[PDB]
């Protein structure tokens, strides 16, 4: 039943810094195959080069 609502006061260690993160370049997401009702369903190919990995 229902939908459990909740606020999550997240810690700054969870808020891992965006400037301190590796930056990826040129993301293109290509959905290869979609099932209309499955569990996994969508095979999507995010093609995006990595100026900074991680």
């Amino acid at each position: 039943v229902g939908n459990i609502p909740v606020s999550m006061d997240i810690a700054d260690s969870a808020f891992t810094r965006l400037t301190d993160a590796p930056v990826i370049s040129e993301l293109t997401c290509t959905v290869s195959t979609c099932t209309h009702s499955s569990d996994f369903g969508g095979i999507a190919v995010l093609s995006y080069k990595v100026e900074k990995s991680g």
Binding site: T33, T35, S38, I43
Partner: protein, 55 residues
């Protein structure tokens, strides 16, 4: 899935059938035939033997 096709009834001629399901590469089934003989259901009404007179 469950494909259905009609291969030719001329044996030797290979029959491709590329079935494409979800997430699989196209499975091309190869059909080949040999010896599909007819065998009609019959019933004898003769023996076909020669006569022999007993005198």
């Amino acid at each position: 899935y469950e494909h259905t096709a009609i291969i030719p009834n001329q044996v030797g001629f290979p029959y491709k059938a590329h079935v494409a399901r979800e997430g699989y590469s196209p499975l091309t089934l190869q059909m080949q035939v040999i010896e599909t003989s007819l065998e009609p259901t019959l019933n004898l009404e003769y023996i076909t033997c020669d006569y022999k007179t007993k005198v």
